[PDB]
Each structure stands twice: as structure tokens, then as C-alpha cells.
Symmetry: D2
Subunit: 463 residues, 4 copies
């Protein structure tokens, strides 16, 4: 009574699962009929999507290429080798001095595997405070001492912060902190920091306290590949990353690590085996070979002249957006940007990030509420350029986005003035708001004028 | 100088990345021109592959449906809700008594998140010993006390084993062990156990020592959904699983957990919030929404009449294979099977699992070497039925596979007799071996006669 | 308005503190007007007591002799050196192969310092189960997994047990257990085991699993010094001890450790520095120099011909007592003794250890209730020979003690027969019991016939 | 062949052990023929010494009074109860609000037992940095991250420091540190801090971060009993102490803890049972009953009018010494004292603490080298008043001690000027130094003029 392979196995999704097919179509329209400003998002290529959705998902290949536990790995080995060699090329790394492991399921597993490789349970870690622009996997506990991040459950973490008035990393306090706490590992990189990192200074702090130094470059890895921001590879021991943000690839993770002789015992680096062993067999099972193939595709694309121009454009778009906002009287943390995002301090407007985020989301403008230096109800919004830049928007287009944001914050203030400063009141002013429906229509019309990678808009089920 | 969206973003893989496209094509041919007997593998549907390779990879949706940190989740919420409700339906679970989290990136992250949710660092865990058929994520350290599994790095594990002479789980020693070691969590389920599990007895042991009881049903989850083996849901607190083995879905993980009133304070279960919080924000970042959509598809497919028939066929095929092997004088661990695999003890033949695995791999027969009870160089091979059954093979076809295995072990013995019992010698007998080249040709001819899900063979680049 | 030094500082205790002086006098009478059978007790010499109560208590001398943090240590150094060299002599240890640290405040700190020296937090330890005759500092958690012993809080312990029917250590289960659990440290020695230890076998088990081996010889250290039981020094890495039980010294602890070349890298032992550093500065402050002086005295006394004869007598007295008990139909665990104690199984009499202990304590016979193999309300009493042997009792005197115990258990049964088997009932039968008052008078009369070390009975305040 | 009880057991030390007896006599002379300025030392009463050296050492009494595991404790219970009730009286504590455990073997075991009672392994602790005047048991690791203190091995510690320029505790940095690190326990009290503690402010910091607050009052407990410094009992949850420094008792420890209703659930304090259980059975075995009797004596003595006058004198003597030093141009940390010690900063003289300590020790002046705020070879000496004040020295006598110190530092400078600033050179100037031999003779003559508690100088073997 078994179904024929043609019926269950070869039939397209639109017949097998209409419900899911319909929902994907609506998500496809949503992605191209709004303004996507989530700084951790991007629209990847169709080529990447074709590798991701391939028979590569069927192959179970525990181990490394050339040291696998089962047979039949002739072509999976070649894909993984190509993915690794392309990873080194994309970041201009000499293979004698750097290795990479491309099996992490995602960025957060890449981080935790890196920790497991070089630390023992309860070893001390320092990372950029969440409220200062850091990331959950770098450590996070609450004021009640509740350990939220797994990094803070299995290791002992302590955050360093930005200067309270300037919004830049306080390198003097970082150093004083590291000399007190004596971390075995210092993490640099972050999720909502709008400036570049002084990796040289991090290296100096690390050397002074006897720490390893790791960069989580998840957010800016695309800018790093195109050499548009400082490279962490010059000064860090280990570099982890996600592959889907500014790098514009699939959802995956990578761990880069130093190889060969150490700088001034005639000693050599010892990370390669520990890192690989941490990924498998300690933490992961078989790799997601479709992710590795998709990632190999993304890495080749990342090494093209067009990608360096894209990374330049991402930077120029964020700058032109920020300058447009500041021209309207708005205040940005650090007063500008050097990367892909702006951090908009709304406290001078009497507004909360949540209120602006909610109203923007009603106009199909997706940003995210975000903490700002000394927040104690986050008081800012975080806006990123990668996704809309991938759709071909240039500086003039990002100035229009700034106008849309300007219109949106204006509607937020008019609501707050009319209905009240309490969240209960603010909501009353959204109901049947003509002005909100008008901005929504303009956003959708503006959004619809640009192209869209990954799927053909002239094949969409909803237009 | 940016590339047009059409050039980099809409162009097919075969133009963007010829190398990777070619390698995927060869892997596609390899998958249908050999005999795939790795018990942890399957060939998933094309519908699953279409959801997996979709614009769903572009959406970042940290949190749970209805409690997300960013906007634009209208359709992702609906996909995740449908995936969860289908997960409960597929395993015949009342929603008032069971919840499920579908965000784990894979099976090994699902396990570790479950541990994190209910245990503190260094809590004691018991699982099926690796050499007795268990899995790395259930705990593993070596005789030198080297902690291999992350489960054994961050927690205190102790394995229980099968009876040395029968190959069945020794439930008496399990109970004596648990009463001595007092684990906070007992794990059941395994990777290479050929019999069903007595979950009732596990529950009795767990109750006697005050332990939680978790089933990792990764290998048999398809059989569990079709109610062809014992359900762990009747007796376990938590059930984790991978979704790509006998379940025939994408690579993903799920964590099921009890809800509602406890059995005999009028107390209720407390797993839902801990489990969800452990997945996010403690360990993972944003979910892989394309995996969740693909998984939702697989779960609907798993709930069809054809899937119950497929699970019945998997069981019948493994049994008919085992009986064919034993009819040739071969010995199976426990003398048969009740699930999807057979475990073939090669020590009575004077052979090592590696030697049979190597020669089978030369004939495009992929099995894996596997330990057998008291091994001290694994002495068996593990053979599974799910993948070839997905291609439509029935019992007569699995008897022919048994003949191919019989021919292969015969060629292995002829080599060992001629060239020697040392691994160095065995290899000498592979070079330009006509007889090996003949079995390979028969395997490829037999393999080519069957259909193949996930991609159309009449569109293959290599035929 | 300060008191003159003569008034507060030179005045005797009997004037400064009549209350405390009176209470010490009553304790002195109690010690010599009853029968002391607590196996962990002894009556030390007056010489030991004079060193203990000396100006040595005034000196603070952090560090080791020859490496102190402060001046004025000329004579404290010499006392500590003499105490250490006498410690090696007392146990017939070559100084090139063994070192000793004499600063532990007591036996339990000596154990914990030894653990700290050679283990990391959460390392695995195995020791003799409490219910099988072991000691709390070797590890103890309850059936609910509550960690009682600090050894079980800061380290991971697992107990091994005696055979359930014979009462001897089950060396086969010990080995099977150690190969499963892989402890970093195995502890031998115990508090209520009546037989000698097979240290050679412990060494074999330890070598097979890669464990350190430590003996806690607190109870039998006097017998060890006199070479009347097996020496742990032949086979263990570390030997800890208390100094006041069968060794007949002050309350103090010592840690012995191997030095010099290892047995078959041309490697040497590495315990000396770790051990010393663990005692100070990790765990302890300045040593109790009066204890070290008293201990030096006890060690010289322990090296006299009279002490070897005393240790022989202790053994002969316990044997003659046990034989007297068994002649009356009583049952001893293992059916006898090879050391200083007997373990009396009262379950064949229908009696609990508590009931016999309580009634004996009413007749000034101090024993202690004690678990027996498989107890699930301890079912035995533990009786030791050191204290009464120190008062000069020989075999005939210990046969009379056996008669007193025999009379006491007879009164316990007569009470249980008349009033009932519930603890509530048993108590009713103690009130104004003539027969109990008669045994008490005979015990006190018999007790008063012997001499008493440490203080002059003909100077007692209460006679 | 056993020795008679009279021979080994009643014979005095001077016959049993001439070596040890002779060495104690020389230590007795050393104690009264020099100037003892070690701040952690005292000369206790003869009454204390008589209880310490008594048959109380023979009794093994595991448990608490009224809940013991063995019989024969009638009089030991009464001694322990009296010792506890006297402990509460001595510190003016209401029994309904405070309990005390008097079994800790010493101060360092009292601290670790307190930690064990209220913390889990790896909980965070903050204490006064060693270099700022704190104590090893409050936490200590080196710049290489080597964990020295057991407090830093089993728990996670972070030190707070004194202000770099004033030498007072930096309460602002303490609070900022505690809000970052979130310790579960903050420790106050120290070994070389010359000022009082603002426990109210510590309580404020503790409340703000959700921490327990513990005072280790080992050094100043005598001053605390006499109400001559701030009481930690007003604001701390737990108070530990040693009993032999300014308290002038035996070597022992105590743990005080709050009882009864908490200040603003109608909740009550929960320390009593945890504290008692941590002492026994978790960490310690049977208590040292002779210490408890001696301590009971010391506590009664501590509650006399003469003791309050003695504590006043200690404070006045340290002040008069400090003023004398500063009158000679010397510099003290914080410019004076409020307690029993002065901390003398020698860096303005171009001298190291070791050099002054070494030369003082050659003149029978025992001080100890000590770190000073920001030291990076300690640069100070720590001098304490309790011991010499116990011999009856008043302010005029401490001015003469200041002159002796002045003469000694003068001889140190003359040596450094003649022979050199390298330690190698300084030593050359000690050989056959007439001037050093002259100060030694004056110190011994001055020292001999005063009385001496604990033993009669007119019975000394060496005069």
C-alpha cells in the first residue's frame, strides 16, 4: 500500500502542501513589498538557494574530508574542501597561517564550539555588553544574577561597555577590567555597534592579561571580506562568523583559526585540532551538506568585483541615511557610522524604540528597537543597509527611506501628543489611522519599484 | 560598479557556480547508482526540498510565534505554528498534554538544549553506551577519562550497556547502576540497537531513583509516528529527535515535552518555558525558517496513509534482509530486528567491520562499521532499510541486497585467505580486483532500476 | 584600668573559670568511671597533654620550616622538623621516598587538602560506602541525591561496597565499578571495617583505571606504625591520617606522600609541592604549633617498644572480646576481627543498634550504633579496643566487658519482650529499671579498678 | 610487655620527651625576651592554656549539643552550650537574633564552612584585595590567573581595593564592581587595614546587588567585643572570626549568623541549619573539645571590665606608636590608625619591607613585611599592638618601641648607604654588625622588664 515515488517524492510543493506553499508565497511578497532595515538580514542569491535546496541534504558525512567515518563521500569531500579554500580566499588568508571549519550549523553554534575548543567549563570570558551593542552569545546575565546566555551558564562572563557619553568602546575601562577579572578569552565584535573596532588595541589588552582574543564578525563579515573595515585577522587568534548577514549567504557558521608558527620557544599554534574536535565529535553530528554547498556558492560570489562594490555601497548608503536623519535634527549614537548600520537615539524625542518600531512595522518598515548607552524599554532603533542595498538601492534611495522614517517618527510624536505618553495611550492612536495607511501605501509603492534576488517577482503568486 | 540584481541574484546555480553545480550532479548520480544502507540516511521528498530552498532563508525571527523581538513575522509565525501543530498530530499527541519546539538546528542541538533546560552544569546523566548502540550526544568518555562528548564535558555521564551474551539492554544492571549513580536524567534511544525499548521499565527505573526520563528517538521517529514501534510518549518526560532519518524530512531537530497536570500536590509540569528559553535565547539565535517550513511539509507527509505503509515496509525489509543473512550462516546481534536496521556481527567470520565496509564501499554499497557487545576495530557492520525502501524496494529487493552483501563478504574472505589477516595485506587484494569490479557493475545495474525521490532522474546531468 | 598580668594571665583555671573547671573535672571522672568502647577514641599521655597546653599556642608561623613569611621561628621550625622526621620514623619510611606534612588541623582537613592538591573541582573519587564501613570525608550523598559530604559537593564521588553476604570488600565489584566510573582518585581505609585491606589489589585496580590511590588510615594508624596490620605505604600514592585514635596522640592530621623516582620516562613523583601548597596557602592559615609539638611527642611515644606491645594487645583484646561474644551466640560481621574493633550485627536478635547503644550508655558503656551490610535504623553496634587497652585492660578484662555487653543486650531483649518492639515502648522500660541500675553499679566498680593516663586520678576533684 | 600506665601515660613531658620540652622552654624565653609586634599574635591566659591542655582532648562528640551521634556527652554538651552562650554575651548579641557555631577548627575553616553553607560551587565572592590589606581566605589569584586561595579554586572571586592615593577603601569603586560582577557574597574585614569599616555602606552595596554580606572580624574581634570599633553585627548576615588574635583566646574559629524574622513576606532567616550542617557533617569531623573549653574560658575573660580596658589600651598604644613614628618623619598608610595596627609605608625611605623586617628580626623585634596600596617586594611593614599590650605595656612603652623601630630603620639605611641597594649587598652589612648587636641587647633588656601571661617566668628553664 506504499505511495509511488512519483506521488510523494517527485511531486512539487504546490501540490503536496498547498498550505505551506501559499504561506511561502506571501512571505515572498512581504519581502519585496516593504522596506527591510533589520541589520542582521539580507536577501541571498538564487544560486545560493538552489544549492541549499538540493539532494545534498540527503548525505550524512560525520567527520572531516579525508577522515570520515563512512563511505560514499567522494563528492561531499570536494564540496567541503572547495568551501574551505574559498573561505580562506574570500578573507585574503594564507592557508599556511589560517584554517577554517565550515560545519557549524549557525553562528551561535560556531561561537559555542570555539569556546569549547579553547576553554574549560567556568573559564572567564569578556564580551561587549548587550546594552552597549554586544551579542547574547558573548555573555549575558541579568541584574538579578540570572544567567541568560549559555555562555554565561557554562562559563564565567563579564561584559565591558561603551563610554556613557560618547558611545565608543571604552578601551581604558576594557583594559582595567581585563586586568582585574583575568579572562581566559576576550571577545570583540558586536550586533549594534556603529563604529569600527581597534583590534590592535584589543590585542594589546589581551597580551597584557594573558587572554585569547576572538572576533565574532557575524555582522560585518561582508565588509571584512571586501576589505572595507578593519580586518580582525591581523590581530585575533580566532574569528567566528555567521554567513547570512552582510556576507549574503545561507544560514551557516564558520570558525577561522590561526595555524603555523607563533609570533614572539619556537612554538606553533594549537587551535586546528581542538577546533575541529569541538565541532565534531563533541557538539555536532553530521554536517548540513546543503548548507556547505550553498556557503561555497556564497563565498565565490563574495570574492567577485561586484561584491566589493556592494560592500562599498552598503557603507555609503548607511552614511547617506544617517546624514539625512541628522539633517532633520535626529541624533545617532557616535554621531554617524563606519559600517552597515545606524543606531538612532530616540530619547531626545521623548520616544521609546518600541513605539517607533511598532508604527514602522505598520507601514511595512521593519527596524528593531535597540538599547543605547546607559538605558536602564530600549530607547533607540537599529537600522541596517545590507538588505535594501542588495535590491539595488543607492544613496538617493536611502535618503527617501530616511524621509519615510522621518514621516514615521512624526506620526509617532503626533500620536503621543494627542493620546498620551503611556503605552496604553499610544495604542489607541493606531486604530484606523489614515496617516499611517497613507505612509504604508507610499512605502509599498516605493518598495515595488526595485528588483529582488533569490526568486523571480514575475512568477510570484501574489502581485 | 554594483552588479545588477539579475546578474548575481537571479541567475541559476549552473551559471553562477559551475564547479558546485557539477559536484551536486555527481552526488545526485551517486545517490541513485549505488545501494545506500546507512541506517541514519534517507532520501527526502522534492516538496521538502522546495521549502528548504526558498526565500524563507532570508527571514530572521528571534523568539517564539506571538512573542518575537522584531516585526514582519505574520507569515513566519503561521508556518511555525503549523509546523508545531503538525508535529503533535504526527505523533498522536494531545496538545493539552504535550508541547513541541521546532527551532533546534539539528538533533544534537536539540539534545543539548533539552539538557540545558532541565539540568545544571555537572548534573548526572545516564545513556546507552556507545559500544552497545548508543549515541555520542548521550555521553562519551574514553578509558583514559578523556571527555569526548560535550554531554560529558558539561555534565557528569555514566553509560549503561547491553547484556554481553544476548545483546539486549540489561535492565537489571541499568537499575542497579541508576540506584548507585543517582542521575538527574536517564536517556533512552540509540543509534545501532536492533530491538524495541521497554519504556515502561525505563519509567520504573527513573521513578525509583528520582530521575527525569528522556527518549532520543532520532533513528526510529518515523516508525514512532506510524505507531510501528513502542511510543516513548507514554512514559518519557521529554522526547527529542532529528527529522531526517526514518522521519524522511529535512535536517532539523525537535524537542517534545509534557504539559499539564502531573500523574500521582495537584502539580503541573514545568518543562515548556525552560525548554523554549534554553533553545532561545540561551543557546540559539534566529531559527532556520526554511528548515521549519520544510519540516512542516515533512510532518504532513509523515501523517499520510502512505507513510504508515512505508514504515511497515521498512520494518518488513529489514526483517527479510536479516532472515536472508542468517540463512547464509551469518549472525546478527540479538538474532534479528524489530526496527529499521540489522547489526551484523562479523567476528564469527574472522572479519572486521572496516574490511567489509571498505570493500562494500568499492561496490557502491554504503554501510558503516559498528561496534558489537564487548568489542575491545569495530567487529560488525550496521545496515539500515529506510533509504532503499524510500526508493520503492520491497522484500524481494532486500533479499537481492542480502545476496550482494553475501557476495561482498565472500570476496572479503577470499582476499583475507589469499593475502593475509593484517590490514596491510587486505589492501593488497583490492588492486585491480576483477571480482570487485564485477559486483560493482551488478550493484550499479540493480540500483539503476528503481525510482528516486527529491529530483527527477530524467533531468540528471550524468546518466 | 587594665587588670595586672598576674590577675588575668597567670591565675589558674580553677579560680578564673570555676564553671569550666568543674565541668572538666566531671568529664575526667566520666572518662575513668565507665567503659569506653568508641573505636575512634583513646586516652592520650600526660606528656602529649603538656605540649598541647603550652605557650606554643601563641606562635603564628605561616609557611613551612625554612620558608616562613615572618621571623621568630627558630624553635618552631625545629619542633616541626622533629615532628616530621619522627612521623617518617614511626611508619618506617625512607625520607628519600616519602614526605609528610604535619600542619592539617585534623583528619578531615588533611583529607580535603590532599584532594585539593591532586584533583580539580568535579574530579571523580571512589571511597568505601558509609553503610559498608566507610567515612563521611570519602564521599556521601543520600538516595535523594542530596550531597552531604563536602567531598561529594566539590568533587564527583561514587561509593564501592562490601559483599552483601560475607561483609568483606567486594574487590571484583570495586574493579568493575572503577572501570565504569573512571575515578581520578580511589580512597581505601574506613571507620567500621573489621578486616585488613588488600592494598596490593587496590593498587592493581588503580593501575588498571589510571587512578591515584589514597589510604585514609585514621582508625588503624597505631596498628600501622607498630606493623601489626598491612602497610598502605607499600602500594598507595598518598596516606592521610588523624593522630588521636589508635595512634594515641593529640587531635591533628598528617598527609604522607611519595617522593623520588616513580616505578615503571625516568619520571619522579610530583606530590610534595602540591600537597604543601594545598595545606598552606590554599586552605589553612598558620598551623596550630601546640598540636605539632604534642604530635611530635606522640610520635616518639609511638616509636617505643611499649607501643608495639600496646598495638598487639589492642588486636588481641578485640579478638578475645569478639570470641566471647560469638560464644554467647552473637554474630559479628565477617565473623571476627583483624584490627581494633568488632562490628556486632544485632538484626539476628531482633534489636536495633540504637536500643543497645542507649541502654549501654545508661550503664556508662559507650559504644556507637553502626550500619551493617545491606541495612536499609542501623542494625549493629561498633565496639573498639584502643581506649580501654590504654588503661591496661588485657584479654581477661575484655571478656568481662563482653559479659557486661551480654548482660546489657539481655536487658534490652527483656525490655523489648515486656514493653514492645516500637521505640516508644522500649523507652517505657528504662524508667526506674532496677536491673539497669545494677549493671551500672558493676560497670562503675569494674571501671574504677584500672589506671588512667593523662591526669592523676589521685588529684581528681570527684572520687 | 606493655608499659605501665604510670610510665608512658602519667609521666611529665620533661621526662618523656626532653627534646620537645627543651624546645618549648626556648620558645617560652623567646616570647618574653623580645618585642612581639606581629599584629595577628597575642599571649593568652594560663587559664585558657589549662583548658586547652586537658582531658577534653580525649572526647569524640560528632554533632551538636542535644543532637549527638554517640553517648557520654553530658558534660561536653554543657561546655559547648556555655561556650556558645558566652560567645553571644561577649558580642552583646540577643539569642533570638543571633546564633553561633563554635566548632570550626580555626578561622580559615570557619570561613570556608560559612561559604559552603550559603554558596554553591562557582558562586561569585568579593573580598578586600590582598595587596590592599585583605586575607587569603577572601579570595586570591595571581596575575597569571593561577588560583591560590581555595576560595578562588572552588568559587569565583573578584577583589575590591583601597583608593590608590589615600589608602582608604574605595566605596564608590566597590559599588561599581559589585553591580558589574554581581557576587552572591561580599566579604568585609581584613588583615592589614588600619581604619574602621563602614558596614552600613557595605550593607547598602550588598542590598543594591542582591548579595549576602559577611564580615571576617578575625583581627579586630577583641575590639569588637569591647565595643571599641564599629560592630559588624549591625549590618552583616554572617560574622566569622578566629579566636586568638585581639580576642586573646585559643586557636579556634566561630561563625555567627542571624536568626529570626528578616527586616523589610513575614520571612525568617535561614542560616542556622545550613551553617551547622556545613561545619558538621559536610566539612569537619568531631570537634576539638579542648579548644571549645579553652574558648569558653577566653570568652568569659573577654566579657570582663579588664578586657574592655585592655582593648582601649591596644587602640591607644597603636595610636601613640603611630604618632611617634610620624613625628620622626615616617609615613603611615592613611596617616594613622583606628584599630590595633599601623601600616608603615617604607617606599619614601627607599627601603623594602623585607629589609626592615630582616634587621628587626635580628634585634628580636618581630614585625612582618606587608604590601601597601599599589605596590607592584612588599614596600611596608605591619606592626600590631595586642601582644605587647597584653604584657602590660602602655603608651610610654610603645613610644620606646617606636624609638627601637626608629633605631632599626636607621641601621637599615646606614647599611643600604654603605653596601648597596641590592639585596645581595644589604646582607653583607649584617655580618658582625656591632650596632645591630647593641640594639638587640637593648631590646632584650627592655623586653625583660615586663610580665608575661600563660606561664610563670619564675619557673622558666632559661633565664
Amino acid at each position: 500500500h506504499m505511495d509511488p515515488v512519483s506521488v510523494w517524492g517527485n511531486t512539487p510543493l504546490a501540490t503536496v502542501d498547498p498550505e505551506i506553499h501559499d504561506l511561502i508565497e506571501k512571505e515572498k511578497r512581504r519581502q519585496c513589498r516593504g522596506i527591510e532595515l533589520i541589520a542582521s538580514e539580507n536577501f541571498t542569491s538564487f544560486a545560493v538557494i538552489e544549492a541549499l535546496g538540493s539532494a545534498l541534504t540527503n548525505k550524512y558525512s560525520e567527520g572531516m574530508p579525508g577522515n570520515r567515518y563512512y563511505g560514499g563521500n567522494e563528492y561531499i569531500d570536494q564540496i567541503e574542501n572547495l568551501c574551505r579554500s574559498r573561505a580562506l580566499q574570500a578573507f585574503h588568508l594564507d592557508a599556511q597561517s589560517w584554517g577554517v571549519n565550515v560545519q557549524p550549523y549557525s553562528g551561535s553554534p560556531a561561537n559555542f564550539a570555539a569556546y569549547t575548543a579553547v576553554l574549560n567549563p567556568h573559564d572567564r570570558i569578556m564580551g561587549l555588553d548587550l546594552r552597549s551593542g554586544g551579542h547574547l552569545t558573548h555573555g549575558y546575565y541579568t541584574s538579578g544574577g540570572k544567567k541568560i546566555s549559555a555562555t554565561s551558564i557554562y562559563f564565567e562572563s563579564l561584559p565591558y561597555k561603551v563610554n556613557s557619553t560618547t558611545g565608543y568602546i571604552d578601551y581604558d575601562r576594557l583594559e582595567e577590567k581585563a586586568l582585574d577579572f583575568r579572562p581566559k578569552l576576550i571577545i570583540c565584535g558586536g550586533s549594534a555597534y556603529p563604529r569600527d573596532w581597534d583590534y590592535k588595541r584589543f590585542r594589546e589588552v589581551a597580551d597584557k592579561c594573558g587572554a585569547l582574543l576572538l572576533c565574532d564578525m557575524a555582522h560585518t563579515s561582508g565588509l571584512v571580506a571586501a576589505q572595507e573595515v578593519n580586518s580582525p585577522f591581523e590581530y585575533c587568534d580566532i574569528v567566528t562568523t555567521t554567513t547570512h548577514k552582510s556576507l549574503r549567504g545561507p544560514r551557516a557558521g564558520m570558525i577561522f583559526y590561526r595555524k603555523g608558527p607563533k609570533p614572539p620557544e619556537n612554538a606553533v599554534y594549537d587551535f586546528e585540532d581542538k577546533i575541529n574536535f569541538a565541532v565534531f565529535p563533541s557538539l555536532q553530528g553530521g554536517p548540513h551538506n546543503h548548507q556547505i554547498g550553498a556557503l561555497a556558492v556564497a563565498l565565490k560570489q563574495a570574492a567577485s568585483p561586484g561584491f566589493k562594490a556592494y560592500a562599498k555601497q552598503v557603507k555609503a548608503n548607511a552614511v547617506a541615511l544617517g546624514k539625512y536623519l541628522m539633517g532633520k535634527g535626529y541624533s545617532l549614537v557616535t554621531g554617524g557610522t563606519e559600517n552597515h548600520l545606524v543606531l538612532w537615539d530616540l530619547r531626545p524625542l521623548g520616544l521609546t524604540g518600541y513605539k517607533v518600531e511598532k508604527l514602522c512595522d505598520l507601514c511595512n518598515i521593519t527596524v528593531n528597537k535597540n538599547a543605547v548607552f546607559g538605558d536602564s524599554a530600549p530607547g533607540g532603533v537599529r537600522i541596517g543597509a545590507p538588505a535594501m542595498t542588495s535590491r539595488g538601492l543607492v544613496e538617493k534611495d536611502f535618503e527617501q527611506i530616511g524621509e519615510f522614517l522621518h514621516r514615521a517618527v512624526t506620526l509617532t510624536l503626533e500620536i503621543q501628543k494627542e493620546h498620551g505618553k503611556l503605552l496604553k495611550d499610544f495604542n489607541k492612536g493606531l486604530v484606523n489611522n489614515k496617516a499611517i495607511e497613507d505612509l504604508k501605501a507610499d512605502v509599498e509603492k516605493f518598495s515595488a519599484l526595485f528588483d529582488m534576488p533569490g526568486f523571480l517577482v514575475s512568477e510570484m503568486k501574489y502581485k
